[PDB]
Amino acid sequence: AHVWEDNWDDDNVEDDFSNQLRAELEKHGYKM
Amino acid sequence: ARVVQGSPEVPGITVRVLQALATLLSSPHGGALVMSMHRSHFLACPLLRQLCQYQRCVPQDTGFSSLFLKVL
Amino acid sequence: CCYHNNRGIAAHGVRVLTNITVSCQEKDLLALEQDAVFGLESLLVLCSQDDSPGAQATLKIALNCMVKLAKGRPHLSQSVVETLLTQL
């Protein structure tokens, strides 16, 4: 029931390394 | 552009290609507005235009709709 | 059932029509190709402006049919993609 089979960005396809990366990276929320 | 939509309905019945897509995009936008009830007074004018076009030449329009472009 | 009022039956019908198109290549089916592609965009403009999980599943089914239809018959595919940009 997925349109794009080679989608890198689904609901939950994020491995552990990317999980702590997202955890420490979404918190700041600013970019220069 | 109610008169322009009424005029193009007969041209759309004859040959539309891309005008039928514009008419469908215009009508469903009014339908979504009517879902939000944001003063969508646009479907009644298209219905009156379709009724007038049917009353003008019923048989040619019916044959073009049921023979040439059933999908539109 | 592709030109039916309910969204789910339209999705099932457009799946059936897409699957007939992608499958066997007899000549006196090719006209349905035209019907097929118009069906998709018609269904799309029904299920874009709704924002409900049933309409979201209808989007899934329709877009999977769009991909498969463009994949099987490439000569329709260009028309396919331009219609998609309109609803974008």
Curated annotation (Swiss-Prot), chain A:
Its biological purpose: Component of the 26S proteasome, a multiprotein complex involved in the ATP-dependent degradation of ubiquitinated proteins. This complex plays a key role in the maintenance of protein homeostasis by removing misfolded or damaged proteins, which could impair cellular functions, and by removing proteins whose functions are no longer required. Therefore, the proteasome participates in numerous cellular processes, including cell cycle progression, apoptosis, or DNA damage repair.
Biological source species: Homo sapiens (Human)
Subunit structure: Component of the 19S proteasome regulatory particle complex. The 26S proteasome consists of a 20S core particle (CP) and two 19S regulatory subunits (RP). The regulatory particle is made of a lid composed of 9 subunits including SEM1, a base containing 6 ATPases and few additional components. Belongs to the TREX-2 complex (transcription and export complex 2), composed of at least ENY2, GANP, PCID2, SEM1, and either centrin CETN2 or CETN3. Component of the homologous recombination repair (HR) complex composed of ERCC5/XPG, BRCA2, PALB2, DSS1 and RAD51. Interacts with the C-terminal of BRCA2.
Tissues of expression: Expressed in limb bud, craniofacial primordia and skin.
Cellular compartment(s): Nucleus
Similarity comment: family membership: Belongs to the DSS1/SEM1 family.
Portion of the full sequence shown: 36 to 67 of 70
Protein name per the record: 26S proteasome complex subunit SEM1
From Swiss-Prot, chain B:
Location of Phosphoserine modifications: S7
Disulfide bonds: none
Domain of life: Eukaryota
Location of this chain's protein in the cell: Nucleus; Nucleus membrane
Role: Component of the integrator complex, a multiprotein complex that terminates RNA polymerase II (Pol II) transcription in the promoter-proximal region of genes.
Clinical condition linked: Neurodevelopmental disorder with cataracts, poor growth, and dysmorphic facies: An autosomal recessive neurodevelopmental disorder characterized by severe global developmental delay with motor impairment, cognitive delays, absent or severely limited speech, dysmorphic features, hypotonia and cataracts.
Family in the record: Belongs to the Integrator subunit 1 family.
Protein name: Integrator complex subunit 1
Provenance organism: Homo sapiens (Human)
UniProtKB/Swiss-Prot annotation, chain C:
Compartments (UniProt record): Nucleus; Chromosome; Cytoplasm
Chain coiled-coil ranges: none
Stated family: Belongs to the Integrator subunit 7 family.
Assembly notes: Component of the Integrator complex, composed of core subunits INTS1, INTS2, INTS3, INTS4, INTS5, INTS6, INTS7, INTS8, INTS9/RC74, INTS10, INTS11/CPSF3L, INTS12, INTS13, INTS14 and INTS15. The core complex associates with protein phosphatase 2A subunits PPP2CA and PPP2R1A, to form the Integrator-PP2A (INTAC) complex. Interacts with NABP2.
Job description of the protein: Component of the integrator complex, a multiprotein complex that terminates RNA polymerase II (Pol II) transcription in the promoter-proximal region of genes.
Protein name: Integrator complex subunit 7
Organism in which the protein naturally occurs: Homo sapiens (Human)
Organism phylogeny: Eukaryota, Metazoa, Chordata, Craniata, Vertebrata
This protein's encoding gene: INTS7
